[PDB]
Paper text:
The curving effect of [name] on hPIEZO1 further encouraged us to test if it can stabilize the unstable channelopathy mutants hPIEZO1-[name], hPIEZO1-E756del, and hPIEZO1-R2456H. Indeed, electrophysiological studies showed that co-expression of these channelopathy mutants with [name] resulted in significantly reduced mechanosensitivity and inactivation rate. We then co-expressed these hPIEZO1 mutants with [name] in HEK293F suspension cells and purified the resulting complex using the same method. Surprisingly, with standard cryo-EM analysis, we obtained high-quality 2D class averages for hPIEZO1-[name]-[name] and hPIEZO1-E756del-[name]. Cryo-EM density maps were obtained for hPIEZO1-[name]-[name] and hPIEZO1-E756del-[name] with overall resolutions of 3.1 and 2.8 Å, respectively. The densities of the multi-lipidated C-terminal amphipathic helix of [name] are clearly present in both the hPIEZO1-[name]-[name] and hPIEZO1-E756del-[name] maps. We were surprised to find an apparent lipid density in wild-type hPIEZO1-[name], hPIEZO1-[name]-[name], and even more evident in the 2.8 Å resolution map of hPIEZO1-E756del-[name] in the pore module, where one of its hydrophobic fatty acid tails inserts into the hydrophobic pore formed by I2447, V2450, and F2454, thus sealing the pore to prevent ion flow. Even more surprisingly, the hydrophilic phosphate head interacts directly with R2456, a residue with the more severe form of GOF mutation, on the side of the IH of the pore. In addition, another fatty acid chain of the pore lipid interacts with the acyl chains of the covalently linked [name] lipids, forming a stable hPIEZO1-multi-lipidated [name]-pore lipid complex.
PIEZO channels transmit mechanical force signals to cells, allowing them to make critical decisions during development and in pathophysiological conditions. Here, we report several near-atomic resolution cryo-EM structures of fast-inactivating wild-type human [name] (hPIEZO1) and its slow-inactivating channelopathy mutants with or without its auxiliary subunit [name]. Each hPIEZO1 subunit has a curved blade structure, and the three subunits form the trimeric PIEZO channel, exhibiting a bowl-like shape. [name], a MyoD family inhibitor protein, has recently been identified as an auxiliary subunit of piezo channels capable of decelerating channel inactivation and attenuating channel mechanosensitivity.
Residue numbers in the entry:
A (entry chain A): 1408 to 1427
B (entry chain B): 2426 to 2521
C (entry chain A): 1165 to 1213
D (entry chain F), I (entry chain E): 227 to 247
E (entry chain A): 1698 to 1747, 1779 to 1803
F (entry chain B): 2135 to 2279
G (entry chain A): 1941 to 1980, 1999 to 2050, 2060 to 2231
H (entry chain A): 2474 to 2521
The structure:
């Protein structure tokens, strides 16, 4: 659902995994 | 013929200048929404606020029973939740 | 380009003197402006009638 | 063709424009 | 020409410039340029037959429209 | 601090209501935003903005534009003050003699002075039943003193 | 038949793709400006022309964001005819001649959009393309225009296909705006670095500070000055034109009205 | 702020290609960056 | 003696007083 998917952000997304 | 002044102030500049001023101030009023909407996404985009309403309602319950010592203690929790944004993230997690 | 400055004069002679001869001048211009580039290189000596 | 579902949607989302969510 | 004269004068060609010439396959056409020349000539003729004291901005119009014709004839 | 807990609670409630309604009526993942909803809210906002700038101007102009109440000389008081010591010649008239010029009468005056542009302009610009007729009385009886 | 062929080749065709919306909008902004300036029945006419410029700009934004060549064709046709018919409703001029001229430029650039096509990448603010100083100043100026920023946001939201609501659309717009302004400043500091520990340049300080002080002076003192200046002007000679001495004597019939006028 | 403008521009790119599922997902990143000040510090570090 | 370098500085810094940086 839109609600749950826009409120799913966590710290793992911002880990520096080869962000080019 | 006679000309009845239906202006009051001055159609040419008095009312005109007032109109401009109003527009500008209404401008700022409307900007007041779409300018700093991003400075609150930390107090308004909380996934699950159930744990915070429990805290708030416990303060209310403890004021009805007049055990005001615990009012001070539960207020301390409320202010620390809102003093550290990272703990808000933890406490407002969707599931756990 | 003299062939063409004459065409300008042809037009303006009509314009200035408002008459029936003037309408004719206007027409002479209109024509030799359309059918004109043809006879600018074909009337050079070949029958400038 | 504004449906009632659309009508509540509209209202709630203007409320979100002012108030939170 | 539509900024110096009005009504039936112009308001036919400017409309056609915006709706036919500029809204076309690459180069306008041949019929556009022909109709432009024709309309300008007709306008000149009828203004000469009298509007009174007619102005001639249609001179510079007709002559520019015949200059372009020469440019596109040479290709 | 009381106001702090009230603000927190208010905001938290509003969020909770929204969360609850999203659980009650979930919105599919990636489902546009419904053309109609957009058109409605957006339209209202635009119209509100129109009424900030244009509507006041409209109202203002509408009210101010209304101007023009016929004012005709009730009487034609021609006092031909003559004698330096004792000014007299006060033979004059009033409304009965004064004739509010009709539409036809106005046309006459305008046409009389039509050659002169500004002369006709004056008459024509003044509304019909505006130009009044100065039929000043000339008869005396009033001897002088 | 021929008309159908023209329209087919204006829609299907095989042409390129350009984005001349920026310039079309700029033409319409100039038009708006000169109509606003041209307030000089006339107020009503200028107010209708205002509503018009505005409505047409909104429709243009719609067709641009929805990438409609057919819609732009229709709009162009209608607008050309309507603006040319408004030349007949002159009854309420250099201002109008200029308005016609700039609208002609808009019609020329609009015609170009239709005969070229709409490019795939249409999103992205014009003044956020480069990260210099001019872009910075222009963007900030756009944000200073009373309602342009908010209108742009709401309008775009309504046309662009999004999953988010207005609140959230406005969030991403605010974030982007702020982030751009920061980026421009960061870029300019990399381009022109300032030595470590180099005062702040006496002149720079004097300028900004001075302006602020003068602005504050004009908040308090200047109004007082203006007010006093206007109000002080008082005094227009008023002399009795005539001396009407009516020595009302007789209780029953008051007389003795021998009196004088201006000559005396 | 380079990493944040990339996020913002990716939302824009994903709306032009009409893959609106990823719009919701990239919006989630934006809001978490702005919900935790410490992650903003990490993401906005000068070098890495 | 306002130089052009100073002039841009002034302008940009007043912009920073209002807008960010
Ligand atoms: C290109 C030409 C630019 C000028 C266009 C026409 C000028 C119209 C008025 C422009 C005046 C410029 C002054 C800007 C002052 C900065 C404040 C601001 O919010 O400026 C805002 C834009 O708001 C406006 O609409 C500008 C007008 C503000 C009103 C100030 C004018 C003073 C006259 C009225 C006096 C009363 C003041 C208000 C009374 C109470 C209001 C609640 C810009 O920040 P921002 O958040 O988007 O930033 C993003 C990240 N911080
Ligand atoms: C559901 C009501 C329409 C949306 C709200 C707009 C403000 C009121 C205008 C019409 C009231 C029914
Ligand atoms: C009649 C036009 C608006 C007058 C007041 C209505 C308020 C609008 C509410 C918006 C959502 C409820
Ligand atoms: C006079 C009653 C109308 C209500 C005033 C405005 C309410 C809606 C405006 C903004 C919505 C929060
Ligand atoms: C937020 C804009 C929605 C429409 C305005 C709500 C009613 C407020 C009264 C202002 C008159 C339009
Ligand atoms: C001040 C923000 C940069 C915008 C550049 C022009 C804005 C107006 C300032 C001077 C106008 C006379
Ligand atoms: C921030 C102060 C700088 C000088 C004022 C800028 C121009 C605004 C107009 C007010 C009149 C001084
Ligand atoms: C570079 C312009 C001087 C600083 C800005 C002050 C506001 C304008 C006053 C003089 C305009 C040249
Ligand atoms: C003429 C005095 C100020 C009038 C408006 C100028 C605005 C000042 C801009 C400040 C930095 C661009
Ligand atoms: C009327 C045009 C002058 C611009 C209005 C003020 C612009 C500068 C004031 C504050 C700088 C952001």
């Amino acid at each position: 659902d839109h609600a749950t998917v826009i409120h799913s952000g966590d710290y793992f997304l911002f880990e520096s995994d080869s962000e080019e | 013929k006679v000309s009845p002044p239906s202006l009051g102030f001055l159609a040419g500049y008095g009312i005109m200048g007032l109109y401009v001023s109003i527009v500008l101030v209404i401008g700022k009023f409307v900007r007041g929404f779409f300018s700093e909407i991003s400075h609150s996404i930390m107090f308004e985009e909380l996934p699950c606020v159930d744990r915070i309403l429990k805290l708030c309602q416990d303060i209310f319950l403890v004021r009805e029973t007049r055990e005001l010592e615990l009012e001070e203690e539960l207020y301390a929790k409320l202010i620390f939740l809102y003093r550290s944004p990272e703990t808000m993230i933890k406490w407002t997690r969707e599931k756990e | 380009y003299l062939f063409w400055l004459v065409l300008v004069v042809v037009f303006v002679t009509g314009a200035t003197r408002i008459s029936i001869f003037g309408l004719g001048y206007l027409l002479a211009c209109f024509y030799l402006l359309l059918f004109g580039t043809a006879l600018l290189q074909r009337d050079t000596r070949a029958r400038l009638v | 063709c504004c449906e009632s579902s659309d009508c509540l949607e509209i209202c709630m989302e203007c409320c979100g424009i002012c108030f939170p969510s | 020409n539509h900024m110096v004269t009005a009504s039936a004068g112009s308001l036919v060609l400017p409309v056609l410039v915006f709706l036919w010439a500029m809204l076309s396959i690459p180069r306008p056409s041949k019929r556009f340029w022909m109709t432009a020349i024709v309309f300008t000539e007709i306008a000149v003729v009828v203004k000469y037959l009298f509007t009174d004291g007619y102005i001639k901005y249609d001179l510079v119009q007709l002559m520019a429209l015949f200059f372009h014709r020469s440019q596109l004839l040479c290709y | 601090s009381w106001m702090c807990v009230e603000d927190i609670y208010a905001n938290i409630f509003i969020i909770k209501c929204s969360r609850e309604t999203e659980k009650k009526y979930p919105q599919p993942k990636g489902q546009k935003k419904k053309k109609i909803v957009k058109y409605g809210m957006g339209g209202l906002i635009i119209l509100f903005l129109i009424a900030i700038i244009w509507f006041p101007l409209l109202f203002m102009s509408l009210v101010r534009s209304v101007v023009g109440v016929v004012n005709q000389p009730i009487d034609v008081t021609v006092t031909l003050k003559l004698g330096g010591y004792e000014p007299l010649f006060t033979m004059s008239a009033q409304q009965p003699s004064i004739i509010p010029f009709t539409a036809q009468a106005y046309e006459e005056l305008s046409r009389q002075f039509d050659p002169q542009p500004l002369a006709m302009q004056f008459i024509s610009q003044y509304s019909p039943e505006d130009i009044v007729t100065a039929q000043i009385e000339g008869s005396s009886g009033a001897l002088w003193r | 038949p021929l008309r159908r062929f023209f329209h087919d080749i204006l829609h299907t065709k095989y042409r390129a793709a350009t984005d001349v919306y920026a310039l079309m909008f700029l033409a319409d902004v100039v038009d708006f400006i000169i109509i606003i300036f041209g307030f000089w029945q006339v107020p009503e006419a200028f107010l209708v022309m205002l509503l018009i410029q505005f409505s047409t700009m909104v429709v243009d934004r719609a067709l641009y964001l929805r990438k409609t060549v057919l819609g732009k064709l229709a709009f162009q046709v209608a607008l050309v005819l309507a603006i040319h018919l408004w030349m007949f409703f002159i009854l309420p001029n250099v201002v109008a001649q200029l308005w016609y001229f700039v609208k002609c430029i808009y019609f020329a650039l609009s015609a170009y959009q239709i005969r070229c096509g709409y490019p795939t990448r249409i999103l992205g603010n014009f003044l956020t393309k480069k990260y210099n100083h001019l872009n910075l100043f222009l963007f900030q100026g756009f944000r200073l225009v009373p309602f342009l920023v908010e209108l742009r946001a709401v309008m775009d939201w309504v046309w662009t296909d999004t999953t988010l609501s207005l609140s959230s659309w406005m969030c991403v717009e605010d974030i982007y705006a702020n982030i751009f302004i920061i980026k421009c400043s960061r870029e300019t500091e990399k381009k022109y670095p300032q030595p470590k520990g180099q005062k702040k340049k006496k002149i720079v300080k004097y300028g900004m500070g001075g302006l602020i002080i003068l602005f504050l002076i004009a908040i308090i003192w200047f109004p007082l000055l203006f007010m006093s200046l206007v109000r002080s002007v008082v005094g227009v000679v008023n002399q009795p034109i005539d001396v009407t001495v009516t020595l009302k004597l007789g209780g029953y019939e008051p007389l003795f009205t021998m009196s004088a006028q201006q000559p005396s």
